[PDB]
Structures are given as C-alpha cells and as structure tokens.
Amino acid sequence: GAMEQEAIQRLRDTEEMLSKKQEFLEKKIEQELTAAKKHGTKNKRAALQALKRKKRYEKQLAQIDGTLSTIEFQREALE
Template sequence: MSKLGKFFKGTRSSRARAAPSAQEALARLRETEEMLAKKQEYLENRIQRELALAKKHGSQNKRVY
C-alpha cells in the first residue's frame, strides 16, 4: 500500500461505513421526497411565469429578456 493510502486509510468514521437502520433510511427518504416535491413545484411555477412572460413579450418587445 502506498504512503498516501496508509495516510488516508483511517480518515473514514465508523458511522460512514455502517448502514443506517430501516427507520433512519425511511426518514431520510421521506425528507428527500419532500425536498424534491418542493423543488419540482418551484420549478414548475417558474416555468409557468417564464412562459407567460414570453407569450406577453414574445412578438413585441424582445429586450425584456
């Protein structure tokens, strides 16, 4: 093993290697799902605003963008 490998071998914590329990994994998945749902809603709203703006100024005022 190289010197760098030996140096970095002990830097991982035991928690990083241990698998989370089923309850912890489900909680993390729920949090991730909520975050992704909020992000999706925000992006859909932003798309709608941009489309409305493009339709409003698309053929008349091209400097709005």
C-alpha cells in the same frame, strides 16, 4: 427497528424537498411562458431569455424526476 426507519426517513425527507422543488419549477415554467407571450412583440430580448430560462427549468425538472424514481426504488428496497 429505529435505525432502519431512520434511513427510510432520510430518503423520505429528500423526496419531499425534491417534490417541493418540482412544484416550484412548474410555477416558474408558467411564469416564463406567460412572460414570453407578454413580451413577444414589444421586448424581443426579454421574451427570448424567458424561453431560454423555460427550457433550462424544463431540463432541471427532468433531472429531478429521474432522481425521484431512483429514491423511490432505493426506499422500496429498504422497506
């Protein structure tokens, strides 16, 4: 009943925020890989930092994927 559903809802709210953060990391990747191509020749400094940031978002995005799989598994166990 109510208390059980609440616990599942906490997990759902977390999933939904992490999924939102994924989507935003994907838009950022795309901005960064676009900027690195844009600056490749005329601004090597900006390009190189774009690529470091892209890699950092890629890593953050991986941690988030693993957190989601963990959340889903915990939530199934409670359902």
